[PDB]
């Protein structure tokens, strides 16, 4: 009755979609065959044979990561047409994914969006999982967001996007595809939950005591954030939130829609039962900068809005006492123009432990999504990296030879020049 | 609401400190798994003193375990009752202290104690009404006497208005298991007399003679010596967690006992001990326990009480017994031993009676003595110090790390100040 449509594009989107859609199958007790042994209707559509199929789209230009899904454990569950494969990848280039290669397969996707969105009785919005550092994840998304806003007018479009780490790197042209696509998604999005890989590498070592993690260890921690965000639409609680709701309570202006996502508690199975997990000690863990899942320090900046989401055996009394202690802390600073910054949304179900994982069976959990001016520090470094490479006109012939002009490079720098000018005009006290 | 924080340092304090946890968990009915497994409701009424309720109905101790080498930390964690501690309470280094006092206090201990008191600051803040501290160490080494003295001075700066109580094993005349032992003993008493409110001295030789004559043991291994000390640890503080006929917590054992701030070193004891052969031939009643309490063979220090004078004596009786025969009989000790007790203090005796005897034994009585005869234990360390210091032996290890020669002159001078006051009041 309240239906959500998830879009996973790129290589990051599919590999998160292997771990994200594992939890949705296990939360409602849905077998990998597609059959249970009305809370599931947000992700699973009924069929007359008692078969539940996901409401998801998987897009990539290389079938060498989707054929792993088609020959994996969940081959009988996903729809044969909900996994869309190109023939050749975008090959770490923005112009290939936006003009030449990503143009040829855009018509098949919106054909499949329209078939899924017509069966939705009440559609709340879209969720996007992609990566800025890829050719497909930043190229295909840039025109997909354009042709979604033209067709579907004023729906919500949230983002779960992986940002490049400040030190750890995969590619070499990642400043180009980071700069170029933010010129597009600034005016074609509503809110952007933002993550990276260095920050989760740190957390998985010092908290879960995994010395040598892989992407599967990172994908499940991202897959636990998306569950507690959506958990109000699924199950009932004391007071609920909505995808329409926290879009209104986290962005004050159309240009600033970049919160920071944090999850607590993260702990192993061995250490959980000796410590006592009070409601205070999981909400004083989210405000610690060492637990933040974006490599930036909020002590440099000032908070502007916050959203608190709770699960499990939580009492509304002690949430009010825990937040009231936070407001007396001098090390947390708010803007003068936001006297009321918090919102609490409460759900009853405790989180589910994935067998074979490393997170423990907990009784309460919390995900905190704060808009903060300290994300301008994250963009100061990468705006500096773009200038240091564009000075010698490196790699530009890869971009002008695919169809786009060289003049798109200077315009996308002026857009994030003025976006940087906006963030100190908001964080200045009146 | 009455909270005690435990801390374990050194190897001698870790093994006695670990052995302390099997004794009280037997009295409170806690399994090695961590569940309450007993017979009486009366055990669970006061479990906040030592343990912390966790999620799922399991109990964890309130203790912090610190030692510079991880060998003994693995030896305690791999014990019978070792699986109940907090895994984040295990703070260990990677380099051995080397039995050097300057290694535990100045260089290799100076980088650890930032992470040591940080755990202690967590356990102290979550308490409702903190009462005191309990730290187990040994004077004869560089690990227990290096960080144990250091953790005393750092905590007492943060929490001044408490009672911080240490149980310390002292060097012995005949045993001598360390070569630089009088050097490392004198460097700690300089700061034990300054920032500790109650110190109990335990001897290794006196615990051997109790096991050899009173208990008539054949081979008194180290598993038995720690079980004698663990009885007195759980006997002095039994009026904080059991209902008794006349209650007395540690601060009431503070005001009664110390007249002057620098005389707080106590000689303890346990009193219902018997041998295996003569169990059926000994009468168990309060006038028989009193003779065993004041017996010189049952004291845990190599000091003869007949060669000194007594300042203040306290007794924590345990079990269902009278109060008139308790009070009349341990007054009869004062009248007959009139010359031995001091004349300028009336009523040298404090008596306390609790109504819960320990596991399997129907009565108990822990002796605690504050006498002037402890000056001879402090005199022998001072004389051993002079014979090595006049040749400057073993002193390139201390002076080679940042410790000065003028530090050693101050420690012996303050040691001779302490032996002067005991003779002054005698």
């Amino acid at each position: 009755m309240r239906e959500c449509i998830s879009i996973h594009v790129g290589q990051a989107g599919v590999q998160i979609g292997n771990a994200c859609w594992e939890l949705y199958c296990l939360e409602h007790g849905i077998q990998p065959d597609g059959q249970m042994p009305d809370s599931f209707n947000t992700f699973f559509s009924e069929t007359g044979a008692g078969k539940h199929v996901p409401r998801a789209v998987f897009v990539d230009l290389e079938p060498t990561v989707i054929d792993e899904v088609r020959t994996g454990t969940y081959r009988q569950l996903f729809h044969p047409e909900q996994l869309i494969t190109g023939k050749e990848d975008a090959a770490n280039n923005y112009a290939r994914g936006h003009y030449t290669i990503g143009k040829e397969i855009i018509d098949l996707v919106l054909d499949r969006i329209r078939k899924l969105a017509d069966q939705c009785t009440g559609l709340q919005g879209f969720l996007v999982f992609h990566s800025f550092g890829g050719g497909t994840g930043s190229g295909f998304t840039s025109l997909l967001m354009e042709r979604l806003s033209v067709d579907y007018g004023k729906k919500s479009k949230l983002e779960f996007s992986i940002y490049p780490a400040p030190q750890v790197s995969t590619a070499v042209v990642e400043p180009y595809n980071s700069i170029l696509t933010t010129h597009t998604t600034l005016e074609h999005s509503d809110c952007a939950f933002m993550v990276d890989n260095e920050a989760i590498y740190d957390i998985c070592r010092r908290n879960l005591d995994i010395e040598r993690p892989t992407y599967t260890n990172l994908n499940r921690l991202i897959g636990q954030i998306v569950s507690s965000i959506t958990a109000s639409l699924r199950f009932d609680g004391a007071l609920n939130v909505d995808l329409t709701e926290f879009q209104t309570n986290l962005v004050p202006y159309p240009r600033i829609h970049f919160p920071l996502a944090t999850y607590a508690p993260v702990i192993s199975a061995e250490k959980a039962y000796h410590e006592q997990l009070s409601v205070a000690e999981i909400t004083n863990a989210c405000f610690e900068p060492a637990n933040q899942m974006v490599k930036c320090d909020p002590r440099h900046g000032k908070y502007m809005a916050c959203c608190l989401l709770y699960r499990g055996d939580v009492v509304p009394k002690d949430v009010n006492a825990a937040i009231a202690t936070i407001k007396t802390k001098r090390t947390i600073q708010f803007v003068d123009w936001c006297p009321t910054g918090f919102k609490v949304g409460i759900n009853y179900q405790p989180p589910t432990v994935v067998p074979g994982g490393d997170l423990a069976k907990v009784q309460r959990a919390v995900c905190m999504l704060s808009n903060t001016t300290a994300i301008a520090e994250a963009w100061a470094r990468l705006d500096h990296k773009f200038d240091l490479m564009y000075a010698k006109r490196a790699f530009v012939h890869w971009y002008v030879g695919e169809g786009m002009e060289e003049g798109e490079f200077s315009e996308a720098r002026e857009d994030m020049a003025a976006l940087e000018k906006d963030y100190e005009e908001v964080g200045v006290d009146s | 609401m009455r909270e005690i924080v435990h801390l374990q340092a050194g190897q001698c304090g870790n093994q006695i400190g670990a052995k302390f946890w099997e004794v009280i968990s037997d009295e409170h009915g806690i399994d090695p798994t961590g569940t309450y497994h007993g017979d009486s409701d009366l055990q669970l009424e006061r479990i906040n003193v030592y343990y912390n309720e966790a999620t799922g109905g399991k109990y964890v101790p309130r203790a912090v375990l610190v030692d510079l080498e991880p060998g003994t930390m693995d030896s305690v964690r791999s014990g019978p009752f070792g699986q109940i501690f907090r895994p984040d309470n295990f703070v260990f280094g990677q380099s051995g202290a080397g039995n050097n006092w300057a290694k535990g206090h100045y260089t290799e201990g100076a980088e650890l104690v930032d992470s040591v008191l940080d755990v202690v600051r967590k356990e102290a803040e979550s308490c409702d009404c903190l009462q005191g501290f309990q730290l187990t160490h040994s004077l004869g080494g560089g690990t227990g006497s290096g960080m144990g003295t250091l953790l005393i001075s750092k905590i007492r700066e943060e929490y001044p208005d408490r009672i911080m109580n240490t149980f310390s094993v002292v060097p012995s005349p005949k045993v001598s298991d360390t070569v630089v032992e009088p050097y490392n003993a004198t460097l700690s008493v300089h700061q034990l007399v300054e920032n500790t409110d109650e110190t109990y001295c335990i001897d290794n030789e006196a615990l051997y003679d109790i096991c050899f004559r009173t208990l008539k043991l054949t081979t008194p291994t180290y598993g038995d010596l720690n079980h004698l000390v663990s009885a007195t640890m759980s006997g002095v503080t039994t009026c904080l967690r059991f209902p008794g006929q006349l209650n007395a917590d540690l601060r009431k054992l503070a005001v009664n006992m110390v007249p002057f701030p620098r005389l707080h070193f106590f000689m303890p004891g346990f009193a219902p001990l018997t041998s295996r052969g003569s169990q059926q031939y000994r009468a168990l009643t309060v006038p028989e326990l009193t003779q065993q309490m004041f017996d010189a063979k049952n004291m845990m220090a190599a000091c003869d009480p007949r060669h000194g004078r007594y300042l203040t004596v306290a007794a924590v009786f345990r079990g269902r017994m009278s109060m008139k025969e308790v009070d009349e009989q341990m007054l009869n000790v004062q009248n007959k031993n009139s010359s031995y007790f001091v004349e300028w203090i009336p009523n040298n005796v404090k008596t306390a009676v609790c109504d819960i005897p320990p596991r399997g034994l129907k009565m108990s009585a822990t002796f605690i003595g504050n006498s002037t005869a402890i000056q001879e234990l402090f005199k022998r360390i001072s004389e051993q110090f002079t014979a090595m210091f006049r040749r400057k032996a073993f002193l390139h290890w201390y002076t080679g790390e940042g410790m000065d020669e003028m530090e050693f002159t101050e420690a012996e001078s303050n040691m001779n100040d302490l032996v002067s006051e005991y003779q002054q009041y005698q």
């Binding site: 006592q276 | 906040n48 309720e53 109905g57 979550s126 308490c127 409702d128």
Partner: peptide, 16 residues
């Protein structure tokens, strides 16, 4: 702030 225990352990407002 405060360590909440079971009802039996006489800690806090056990009486009500």
């Amino acid at each position: 702030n405060e360590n909440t225990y079971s009802n039996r352990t006489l800690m806090g407002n056990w009486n009500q």
